[PDB]
Design an enzyme around this catalytic site. Structure first.
Site, PDB file in Angstrom:
ATOM      1  CG  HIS B 350      -7.666   0.686  -2.876  1.00  0.00           C
ATOM      2  ND1 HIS B 350      -7.187  -0.600  -2.967  1.00  0.00           N
ATOM      3  CD2 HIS B 350      -9.017   0.583  -2.830  1.00  0.00           C
ATOM      4  CE1 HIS B 350      -8.199  -1.443  -2.975  1.00  0.00           C
ATOM      5  NE2 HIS B 350      -9.321  -0.750  -2.885  1.00  0.00           N
ATOM      6  CE  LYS B 541       6.765  -0.110  -9.320  1.00  0.00           C
ATOM      7  NZ  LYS B 541       5.988  -0.622  -8.171  1.00  0.00           N
ATOM      8  NE  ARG B 542      -1.228   4.254 -15.575  1.00  0.00           N
ATOM      9  CZ  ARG B 542      -2.495   4.573 -15.863  1.00  0.00           C
ATOM     10  NH1 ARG B 542      -3.432   3.653 -16.018  1.00  0.00           N
ATOM     11  NH2 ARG B 542      -2.825   5.851 -16.012  1.00  0.00           N
ATOM     12  CE  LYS B 547       2.423   3.611  -9.114  1.00  0.00           C
ATOM     13  NZ  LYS B 547       2.389   2.338  -8.291  1.00  0.00           N
ATOM     14  CB  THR B 649      -0.375  -6.120  -6.115  1.00  0.00           C
ATOM     15  OG1 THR B 649      -0.658  -5.296  -7.238  1.00  0.00           O
ATOM     16  CG2 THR B 649      -1.356  -5.846  -5.013  1.00  0.00           C
ATOM     17  CE  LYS B 653       0.594  -8.345 -10.189  1.00  0.00           C
ATOM     18  NZ  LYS B 653       0.288  -7.285 -11.141  1.00  0.00           N
TER      19      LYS B 653
HETATM   20  C1  26W Z   1     -10.127   9.435  -8.615  1.00  0.00           C
HETATM   21  C2  26W Z   1      -9.055   8.839  -9.545  1.00  0.00           C
HETATM   22  C3  26W Z   1      -8.525   7.623  -9.024  1.00  0.00           C
HETATM   23  C4  26W Z   1      -8.611   6.422  -9.728  1.00  0.00           C
HETATM   24  C5  26W Z   1      -8.063   5.248  -9.194  1.00  0.00           C
HETATM   25  C6  26W Z   1      -7.443   5.260  -7.941  1.00  0.00           C
HETATM   26  C7  26W Z   1      -6.893   4.063  -7.398  1.00  0.00           C
HETATM   27  C8  26W Z   1      -7.286   3.919  -5.936  1.00  0.00           C
HETATM   28  C9  26W Z   1      -5.402   4.110  -7.577  1.00  0.00           C
HETATM   29  C10 26W Z   1      -4.771   2.730  -7.243  1.00  0.00           C
HETATM   30  O1  26W Z   1      -4.759   1.859  -8.110  1.00  0.00           O
HETATM   31  N1  26W Z   1      -4.185   2.583  -6.041  1.00  0.00           N
HETATM   32  C11 26W Z   1      -3.463   1.326  -5.725  1.00  0.00           C
HETATM   33  O2  26W Z   1      -4.283   0.287  -5.129  1.00  0.00           O
HETATM   34  C12 26W Z   1      -3.536  -0.952  -5.075  1.00  0.00           C
HETATM   35  C13 26W Z   1      -4.454  -2.073  -4.619  1.00  0.00           C
HETATM   36  O3  26W Z   1      -4.781  -1.856  -3.233  1.00  0.00           O
HETATM   37  C14 26W Z   1      -2.260  -0.785  -4.142  1.00  0.00           C
HETATM   38  O4  26W Z   1      -1.472  -1.983  -4.140  1.00  0.00           O
HETATM   39  C15 26W Z   1      -1.404   0.392  -4.551  1.00  0.00           C
HETATM   40  O5  26W Z   1      -0.440   0.671  -3.500  1.00  0.00           O
HETATM   41  C16 26W Z   1      -2.301   1.651  -4.771  1.00  0.00           C
HETATM   42  O6  26W Z   1      -1.531   2.716  -5.289  1.00  0.00           O
HETATM   43  C17 26W Z   1      -7.347   6.459  -7.240  1.00  0.00           C
HETATM   44  C18 26W Z   1      -7.882   7.628  -7.785  1.00  0.00           C
END
Ligand code: 26W
Ligand code: 26W
EC number: 2.4.1.1
Lengths: 809, 809
Positions: B350, B541-542, B547, B649, B653
């Site tokens: 991701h 979004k976060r 972003k 995503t 929406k």
């Molecule tokens: C290690 C800390 C950490 C925690 C969570 C994450 C996630 C992978 C961050 C995340 O939410 N990424 C998002 O994943 C979505 C579902 O596939 C995508 O639509 C977004 O583009 C992506 O930023 C990365 C690193």
């Protein structure tokens, strides 16, 4: 099957079956293919609970409409045990549930064994609170029990290599179907901070807040459709608490630790901060709840609508908290507030051992509860001013009566605070109440004699006869009807059956069946193998020096040595059972348990003894085990040093269930012998007066060792390693204590105890005369119903009238 | 009232009313006199839950009988939101419950607002897992979601003085009616200890044990009577844990902290021990559960009966844990175990930002998971041996591909471990999957090209259309029927209505009503006052630099400055709304929130602006807020630097709910424009190729500042204190970053962004042509259903066939 268990109507059985199946499916989310006995237990518990709720709602609505005086029973301990059977008994559902479950292919007694005890107490004080709630509901009083919902109750005891090991009692692991969380009635409690003086009075500021969330448990009366409430508080951190980010969330545990665990040290005071926090937490949340309920109907009427009973000094902070609320928040003048407080509060004392008394260091109160310390100082100055006016020039009296104790560390005596701020002070048996007036509270009695009362303890005959001994309840009901279950004085009618051959036989048969059942329980759950024709000689209670489990041990070793000396002589066979938990830090109590198992290791494997003598340590003694062993006992050991057991309540349970008592003239034993007749009790040993005379002269244990050869032999066996071959000096601390530092005079009652035990053995050889004496005990046990006790609190302290009238279903 | 909400039958409404009243009385223990709206919410939730359980039991029994291949979706995050409405939708009960509650005198929408979000995720990754569970149930797959039951989910955001404050999300405070604890399926998890080598293999000994207790939540499919399970593990200490006595009980909190709190840092890796414990905890409990279920039907068939999907690297320890179990416990040889593992596991990536990648220090694994480190070293040596045979002499490739990273601190690259041990690796949008093969995993693609796939993300149209926008769902259903709700490609039929005057009017009316409703919500709950005729310009979004919320801020200030320069010129009125949480430690993200509120403080109170421009920071953005704001939006801001947003995503929406998109050619935006047609999208800015060319030459932000006067003016305003009068240097860190250290090239897309925004304003002036373009977007949104996504995982990775067939009720 048996009459006292109620009707099994076709409509009722059908409805119970359908509700059971409904809960299994919708509540538990299981079907019959995957369900375990624990699932089945839960399905039954939810089915029985549903029958409570209509009555619970309508009882509380009834109190709202009628607005009676409310009784608030504040305790840090509620030793409730299991709830399922008790509820069925009080609702008359036992036979209907037995039938319903039988038709579903289940055994109800087996499902009953799955329920965890609610072990939210240590022993006598906690169990008294529980019997009292049952009696208050049965007598129609608008009563509320308030306490703490400990996550961990009294530890589970395991015995490993003869030693006590403690493990956590995670009683909530599978859920508690009886409680209802009430997060909507959550209340704030304050700690630490500082006091500011404005022109408009004192203000307590900069405090830390912990939330008190209540959980309500129903308390059903006996067949009267009354359902009262036990409200237990649980500690929760506020959501901005500490609010790196992660650590701040993890640190919420610090606030929530207040309700985590029951302190297991009974009759020994430890000034720990966390314990003080628990005491204030229960008091502060409860009093807000009381005041809210009072306002939802002018504080002059407060004592007409509220009674607060303090179960020992553990909730004594109610006194200065009520003052704080009335003076600081409601703006009453001091004198008016004090009048209201005194008329509202009453205090029950449960001990005389000085190390059990709560004496809090001033520095702890200063830091945790700075406004309360100020109020306590003011109470103290006003009180001592009255003492000075009554006894002018008596400066030593002023220092004896002070709430503040001077010394290395200044302390607050919480018992003195309770006496000063209560309109009534009671002991828990006649001899104890007299001792309070003559010795430890003499000065207070001379100042305010009208405050001092007696309320002899009792036990509920629902749990302690009908529930645990249905066989006995039934043979009694056959002769005199069922009314005695809520009017225990009717057992006196049984005296007209003492010469009835049928009754004699039935009483003895019930005991025999109880003994067979218990003997079986022993093999099944503990691979231990006993003779059910032996006399069952039982001492169960917490382990303390004052209770003299050690005196019992000396007798056991005496019997063993006599057998080994004349092995081919007949002796009445005995199974000696001792059980009880020791406080984790109490080294001598832990050594006593080890000694008991060590004696068993020798005695139980000596082929010359055979099955004439067996010594068993009953592991994990608790309410559910008491319900099993007490009905099976022949002989009840109640052998505390005269003047040390305030009342006792196990003593009363044994009397009601057909055991004879060997005991000292201590606590309620005195009143039990008076009721039954001294001829029908096995009384021995020093009276309180004899203990006093010995202390004046000085107790010298060596004298007894020098003059009693049988005693000398036992001490030499202990000292030399006879009971600990691989560790010959293992019991030296015990010997040293007995010979040089015995506060409880074990040797002084030894000779009389052994002689009295011989008289017990002699009577047991004549089954018919043993049983007649039993009948005389059961028949005179009525005074010891907690219904009698509560009726006396109601009329003589709380100023309310009991009632046996049904509410409508 | 509206058709897509199902039937309100007389029998059904009557039954719901009686069950509601039953729960209120027996479950909640209240009557109508004392009940609050929260009580009423709970009574409804329990009533709806009862309709799930029959289907839940029969679904799980069905899988037991048929023994299909089981899909296990492992995630550290499940961002579920509220459950009540979703359940009603999927069971076709919404109109019946609306009627039933109306007849009881309650408003159901008001009761819906009482439910807490289940906020067990941070953002996109967590919400994808949630959409996926819904699609898997809807497609009849035997699927289980496995995660952690965090006591505290994502924090609640409060804004104080323009700054983010965090407070704990105590979501379980009032109970969770949807879950069922299953303490009977509790499993042990091991930590620490050491490895011993016997003649009979390795043994992991002297470990500390933490128990994993499961809680099961139902996951209903859409009108197919399938109810799957989400199983979340909760940490419990064993009862002999640490077993002065008091401290040992209090220290149980140390074990239980594993499940206490969700880590809120997204796209930034912190090597914290507690996080590693969480990752192993979920993996170890889940795999035992998987193996148990497999045995209760020879590991050669394991991959035929089990698929494990790893949601990013967070559960990557599944790979060496499965090896540990197979080799150490089941005694398979290594090669056989490895074959089974690879065929079982698949990995979804991701992100591409290097600081987001998990690289665990070896020393932490050494101490916590010593046997796993050994297994990882062995995996690495065998893997590198294959690399060496394929690319002989290429020593730099060996160091690039290693699972072990050499340096100051040796680390394990968990992404490399996942690729080595999985049969499939996928990105989450076409451009992202291509980037994986061309750049960060190039070496792996060259070794094993067959492993690499694309699975473009999607969203569930149950929650993200029917539930949140019933008005739109209804006007669509009127024209094309209801089948599109589970076959979203049918929305293509709407293209034949693009010239239909009635449809145009109804689409525009639905948007207008949604905007009025949201504008009202704003005043009611947040005392903020907006013009509902303005264009609603939304970026939610976060908060992250990639972003580019900052690029949006530059545009807002540009609009403001243009108004102040020519105040009497007409401009299309806008309400610019930005919302999202910042990770607690991410200083720049916190400064961006402050900048947004600071701009609002100036803009919203300038009388010359009037109601032509308003800037609002939407506080506490979460799933339940998304459901409200997304239906109300006109313009969706999707403006990440090309190559940085893996998919997005939220973008999907907005498209489904009738907003047009302004965006870069990044993540799924590329496929959205391809589906709708580039003419019907507002595309601007650098493509990935242009970003690469700029990096080659070197990004110099000064050049843009020197050549664009409007940009220079904004930077001077920020620097000089125009947006922070009392603290003139407040935003210096922001200016400094933009001018000297901007990894995301904000200035490089500024000119093109502003020009594109002018084209948006121009179209919005022609309501009819705006709405036609909207219709062209909605009509081509079908590809972005998560039903399409899951069907592709099923067929191309898991090797199972989806099914739309009903199970019987
Ligand atoms: C290690 C800390 C950490 C925690 C969570 C994450 C996630 C992978 C961050 C995340 O939410 N990424 C998002 O994943 C979505 C579902 O596939 C995508 O639509 C977004 O583009 C992506 O930023 C990365 C690193
Ligand atoms: C400060 C530690 C501490 C904790 C508990 C207690 C209790 C008061 C001990 C207790 O349980 N006492 C018993 O109270 C029973 C009920 O009145 C009596 O029957 C027993 O005689 C008395 O020992 C004292 C001290």
């Amino acid at each position: 099957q048996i009459s006292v268990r109620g009707l099994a109507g076709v409509e009722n059985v059908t409805e119970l079956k359908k509700n059971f199946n409904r809960h299994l499916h919708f509540t538990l989310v299981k079907d019959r293919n995957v369900a375990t006995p624990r699932d089945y237990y839960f399905a039954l518990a939810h089915t029985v609970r549903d029958h409570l709720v209509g009555r619970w709602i309508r009882t509380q609505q009834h109190y709202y409409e009628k607005d009676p005086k409310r009784i608030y029973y504040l305790s840090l301990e509620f030793y409730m045990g299991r709830t399922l059977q008790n509820t069925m008994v009080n609702l008359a559902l036992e036979n209907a549930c037995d039938e319903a479950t039988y038709q579903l292919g289940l055994d109800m007694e087996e499902l009953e064994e799955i329920e965890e005890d609610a072990g939210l107490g240590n022993g006598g004080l906690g169990r008294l609170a529980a019997c009292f709630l049952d009696s208050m509901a049965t007598l129609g009083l608008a009563a509320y029990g308030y306490g703490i919902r400990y996550e961990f109750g009294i530890f589970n005891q395991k015995i490993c290599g003869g030693w006590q090991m403690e493990e956590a009692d995670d009683w909530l692991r599978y859920g508690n179907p009886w409680e209802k969380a009430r997060p909507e009635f959550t209340l704030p409690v304050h700690f630490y901070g500082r006091v500011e003086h404005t022109s408009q009075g004192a203000k307590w500021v900069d405090t830390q807040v912990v939330l008190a969330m209540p959980y309500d448990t129903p308390v059903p009366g006996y067949r009267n459709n009354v359902v009262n409430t036990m409200r237990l508080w649980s500690a929760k951190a506020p959501n901005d608490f500490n609010l790196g980010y992660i650590q701040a969330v993890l640190d919420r545990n610090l606030a929530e630790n207040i309700s985590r665990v029951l302190y297991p040290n009974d009759n020994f005071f430890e000034g720990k901060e966390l314990r003080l926090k628990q005491e204030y937490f229960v008091v502060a949340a409860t009093l807000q709840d009381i005041i809210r309920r009072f306002k939802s109907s002018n504080f002059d009427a407060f004592p007409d609508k509220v009674a607060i009973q303090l179960n020992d000094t553990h909730p004594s902070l109610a006194i200065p908290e009520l003052m704080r609320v009335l003076v600081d928040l409601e703006r009453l003048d001091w004198d008016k507030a004090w009048e209201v407080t005194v008329k509202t509060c009453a205090y029950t004392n449960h001990t005389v051992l000085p190390e059990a008394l709560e004496r809090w260091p001033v520095h702890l109160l200063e830091t945790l509860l700075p406004r309360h310390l100020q109020i306590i100082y003011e109470i103290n100055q006003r009180f001592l001013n009255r003492v000075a006016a009554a006894f002018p020039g008596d400066v030593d009296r002023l220092r004896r009566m002070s709430l503040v104790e001077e010394g290395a560390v200044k302390r607050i005596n919480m018992a003195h605070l309770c006496i000063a701020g209560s309109h009534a002070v009671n002991g828990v048996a006649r001899i104890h109440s007299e001792i309070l007036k003559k010795t430890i509270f003499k000065d207070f009695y001379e100042l305010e004699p009208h405050k001092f009362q007696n309320k002899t303890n009792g036990i509920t005959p629902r749990r302690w006869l009908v529930l645990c001994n249905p066989g006995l309840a039934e043979i009694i009901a056959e002769r005199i009807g069922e009314e005695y279950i809520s009017d225990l004085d009717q057992l006196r009618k049984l005296l007209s059956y003492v010469d009835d051959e049928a009754f004699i036989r039935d009483v003895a048969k019930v005991k025999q069946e109880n003994k067979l059942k218990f003997a079986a329980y022993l093999e099944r759950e503990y691979k231990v193998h006993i003779n059910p024709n032996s006399l069952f000689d039982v001492q169960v209670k917490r382990i303390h020096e004052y209770k003299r489990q050690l005196l019992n041990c000396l007798h056991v070793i005496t019997l063993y040595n006599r057998i080994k000396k004349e092995p081919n002589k007949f002796v009445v066979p005995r199974t000696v059972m001792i059980g009880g938990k020791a406080a984790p830090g109490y080294h001598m109590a832990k050594m006593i348990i080890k000694l008991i198992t060590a004696i068993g290791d020798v005695v139980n494997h000596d082929p010359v003894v055979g099955d004439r003598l067996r010594v068993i340590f009953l592991e994990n003694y608790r309410v559910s085990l008491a319900e099993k062993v007490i009905p099976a006992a022949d002989l009840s050991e109640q052998i505390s040093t005269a003047g040390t057991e305030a009342s006792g309540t196990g003593n009363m349970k044994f009397m009601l269930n057909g055991a004879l008592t060997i005991g000292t003239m201590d606590g309620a034993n005195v009143e039990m012998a008076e009721e039954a007749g001294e001829e029908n009790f096995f009384i021995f040993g020093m009276r309180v007066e004899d203990v006093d005379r010995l202390d004046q002269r000085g107790y010298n244990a060596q004298e007894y060792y020098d003059r009693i050869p049988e005693l000398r032999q036992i001490i030499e066996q202990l000292s030399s390693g006879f009971f600990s071959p691989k560790q010959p000096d293992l019991f030296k601390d015990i010997v040293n204590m007995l010979m040089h530092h015995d506060r409880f005079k074990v040797f002084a009652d030894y000779e009389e105890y052994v002689k009295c035990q011989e008289r017990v053995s002699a009577l047991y050889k004549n089954p018919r005369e043993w049983t007649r004496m039993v009948i005389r005990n059961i028949a005179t046990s009525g005074k010891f119903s907690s219904d009698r006790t509560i009726a006396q609190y109601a009329r003589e302290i709380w100023g309310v009238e009991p009632s046996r009238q049904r509410l409508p279903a």
